[PDB]
Write a protein that binds this ligand. Structure first.
Ligand SMILES: [Mg+2]
Lengths: 190, 217, 48
RNA sequence: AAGCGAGAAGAACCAGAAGACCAGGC
């Protein structure tokens, strides 16, 4: 029993965004709950990233592109690229920083940071798309070693990741989260 | 405590041998029988393991042995009553220690392989980076074996028609292996440029052409 | 290792390994029987 | 030459004995 743990160990609106997104994409959230937990933690970390940080001479500095439906997310991306002139990233980013006027992709991983980082960098082809990567073990690393955040904010994010890691281990499913199959897509039209 | 290690520059703290300076030779188990070969001294003397201290002269080498500044190295620059100040070799960090405390890469970033092999990273691996060099060969190099090179975004060169070309310019290739291709100049040198073409799938569209094989598109 | 004349009927002249144990490892013949042993007391009594 | 309704990708992804002895092929 893990889904109840995810429900009770997350912000209600974060889990709401996760479940609505998944339902949009057509996946049964009662079976593949590992993707449920992963999406929830990713959304949570993105919110923390865009939490308490404001651009002013108060306005949110970071707009959370993830967590909203596909058309709305792409509308946000297109509007930002049309006003600021930033190149439209073909892959949906996760956030946009107005001060540096550049999109950011946030990824939380349990494997070593650099392998995930290089994987993403190669996939994106480095088309002017800064990316930041967190890990459950409690280390971070980003493109050009730029985190665009105060040390205390990143410390809070990493501590939250470590705490959820320890709670989930207390539940004993840490090894279960270490498994994720390609796809069990066999829904015949009946 | 009292510990002595070979190779250290020591001094004599008492006796008729006072102020004599020398380099330790050997060491023993309990009675160290430390023997320092004094500077400009053909003979070898004998001292107890408490009579010698690690003294150093102005302009010599020193390396911390223990304490808060362990691992730092440099050169003492002043001799106060007992404190000795020096500046770290690797960085400008200030260092104050006793004399006895001393002894005697992102996807598509230009990298230096060797003076004449300023390559461009085209693939990130766990331990290595593929690097397309200026000759058109792809080499694999360890992450720490290359240095990040400062890109000259304002570089200017001549193309095949002696037109001025600049970083970010779109050029056509009219000679050499890539003749007929078109690309964006990413890194520019007088004789060659690293170009990008999204239609080119090899090396993620990163190729290299001589500047005399280019014409501004 | 040589096939002694006394191996007639007691050991197989043909059956023997051809490696480094030629002639040392032998094989009994079909009708060969190795004695089991017996007490000589009755023989001694008969002789006396 | 054909020509009679719409698309694109959230999250992240290996194993050693060693030694002795015996049988055996060459
Ligand atoms: Mg992402």
């Amino acid at each position: 029993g893990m889904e109840d743990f995810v429900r009770q160990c997350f912000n209600p609106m974060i889990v709401e965004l996760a479940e609505k997104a998944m339902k949009e994409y057509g996946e049964d959230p009662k079976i593949e709950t590992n993707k449920f937990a992963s999406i929830c933690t990713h959304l949570e970390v993105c919110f923390m990233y865009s939490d308490f940080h404001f651009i002013d001479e108060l306005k949110h500095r970071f707009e959370i592109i993830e967590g909203r439906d596909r058309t709305m997310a792409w509308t946000v991306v297109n509007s930002i690229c049309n006003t600021t002139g930033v190149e439209k990233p073909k892959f949906l980013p996760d956030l946009y920083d107005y001060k540096e006027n550049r999109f950011i992709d946030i990824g939380v991983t349990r494997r070593e940071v650099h392998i995930y980082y290089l994987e993403k960098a190669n996939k994106i082809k480095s088309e002017k798309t800064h990316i930041h990567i967190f890990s459950f073990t409690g280390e971070e690393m980003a493109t050009k070693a730029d985190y665009t955040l105060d040390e205390e904010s990143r410390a809070r994010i990493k501590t939250r990741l470590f705490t959820i890691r320890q709670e989930m281990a207390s539940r004993g499913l840490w090894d279960s989260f270490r498994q994720s199959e390609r796809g069990e897509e066999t829904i015949e039209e009946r | 405590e009292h510990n002595f290690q070979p190779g250290d520059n020591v001094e004599v703290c008492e006796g008729e041998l006072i102020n004599l300076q020398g380099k330790i030779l050997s060491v023993d188990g309990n009675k160290i029988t430390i023997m320092p070969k004094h500077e400009d001294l053909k003979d070898m003397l004998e001292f107890p393991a408490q009579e010698l201290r690690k003294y150093f002269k102005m302009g010599d080498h020193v390396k911390v042995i223990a304490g808060r500044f362990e691992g730092d190295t440099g050169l003492i620059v002043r001799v106060e009553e007992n404190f000795v100040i020096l500046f770290s070799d690797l960085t400008m960090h200030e260092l104050k220690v006793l004399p006895r405390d001393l002894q005697l890469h992102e996807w598509g970033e230009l990298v230096q392989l060797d003076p004449q092999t300023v390559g461009v990273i085209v693939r990130l691996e766990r331990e290595t980076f593929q690097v397309l060099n200026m000759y058109g060969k792809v080499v694999t190099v360890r992450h720490q074996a290359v240095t990040r090179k400062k890109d000259n975004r304002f570089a200017v060169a001549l193309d095949s028609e002696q037109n001025n070309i600049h970083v970010k310019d779109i050029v056509k290739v009219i000679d050499g292996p890539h003749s007929g291709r078109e690309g964006e100049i990413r890194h520019l040198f007088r004789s060659f440029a690293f170009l990008h073409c999204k239609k080119l799938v090899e090396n993620g569209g990163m190729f290299v052409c001589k500047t005399r094989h280019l014409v501004l598109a | 290792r040589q096939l002694h004349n006394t191996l007639w009927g007691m050991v197989c002249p043909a059956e023997t390994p051809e490696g480094h144990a030629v002639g040392l490892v032998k094989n009994l013949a079909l009708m060969a029987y190795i004695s089991v042993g017996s007490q000589p007391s009755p023989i001694l009594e008969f002789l006396e």
